[PDB]
């Protein structure tokens, strides 16, 4: 009830610029709030870089168990995982957990060099009917977050059927689409966004992420407790690019979501 009221009063409240898209699938209904405005995605671009290598894997049968090499080099401003195999290898597969569960960067960029550079990532989500998102750069340069720049941006509604596609949908193989709902259900990162406003009861797959400008985003699958999947999208950035991040807004606007259903 008064949906629109409560988003747009937790947007001025918070004083920066807040998206939102929601696909409730039981009955096909959606929830916008400047749905239509690109926002930088941030880390939460790695779900379209992991779901691009899984379709290679449809037809390269073995790519998920082939190593990549990690060099110190390689090394950018958050790498949990690949700093423990420097000098060694990691799997396909091993780095997309990586960047999916714990958001490691390095093993983003090495997702996209396996799929020819950010162009690849992109041609992905235009194979898959998603016409609005593009990725431009690598690790860490894709997080600048600069008002009104449109590299590795999208919009909440684009994304938002693009998850649906991907984890509920075909835009998968079957086998895939389960491992990539898998991984989502396994984020580490997730608990205090998208998931903070929600029932403990339901359960949810998520990729967070954050970049300059305050930036603070979080997009996800949500199996309500005896009802259909709910495809959220929460992005949100600030006027400062200093700004302090603010899951809380993301958590307040699933919050709002949820009683509104
Ligand atoms: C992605 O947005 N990033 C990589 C890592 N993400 O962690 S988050 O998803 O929990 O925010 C650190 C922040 C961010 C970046 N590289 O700026």
């Given at each position: ?39 930088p995605?941030c ?33 950018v401003n ?27 960067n390095?093993?983003?960029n ?8 950010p ?17 431009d750069r690598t690790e860490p340069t894709l997080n600048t977050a600069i008002?009104?720049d449109?590299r590795d ?58 970049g300059d ?49």
């Amino acid at each position: 009830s008064a949906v629109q009221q409560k988003l747009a009063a937790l947007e001025k409240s918070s004083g920066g610029r807040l998206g939102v898209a929601l696909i409730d699938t039981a009955d096909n209904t959606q929830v916008l709030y400047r749905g239509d405005e690109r926002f930088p995605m941030c880390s939460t671009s790695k779900v379209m870089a992991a779901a691009a290598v899984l379709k290679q894997s449809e037809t390269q049968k073995q790519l998920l168990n082939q190593p990549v090499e990690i060099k110190p080099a390689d090394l950018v401003n958050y790498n949990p995982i690949a700093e423990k195999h420097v000098n060694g290898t990691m799997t396909l597969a091993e780095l997309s957990a990586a960047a999916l569960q714990y958001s490691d960067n390095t093993a983003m960029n090495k997702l996209i060099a396996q799929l020819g550079g950010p162009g690849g990532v992109t041609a992905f989500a235009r194979a898959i009917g998603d016409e609005t998102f593009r990725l431009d750069r690598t690790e860490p340069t894709l997080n600048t977050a600069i008002p009104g720049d449109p590299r590795d941006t999208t919009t909440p509604r684009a994304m938002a059927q693009t998850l649906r596609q991907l984890t509920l949908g075909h835009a998968l193989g079957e086998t895939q689409r389960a491992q990539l709902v898998t991984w989502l259900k396994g984020n580490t990162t997730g608990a205090a966004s998208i998931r903070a406003g929600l029932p403990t009861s339901w359960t949810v797959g998520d990729k967070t992420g954050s970049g300059d400008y305050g930036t603070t985003n979080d997009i996800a699958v949500i199996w309500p407790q005896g009802r259909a999947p709910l495809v959220l999208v929460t992005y949100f950035t600030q006027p400062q690019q200093n700004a302090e991040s603010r899951r809380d807004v993301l958590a307040s606007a699933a919050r709002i979501i949820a009683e509104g259903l």
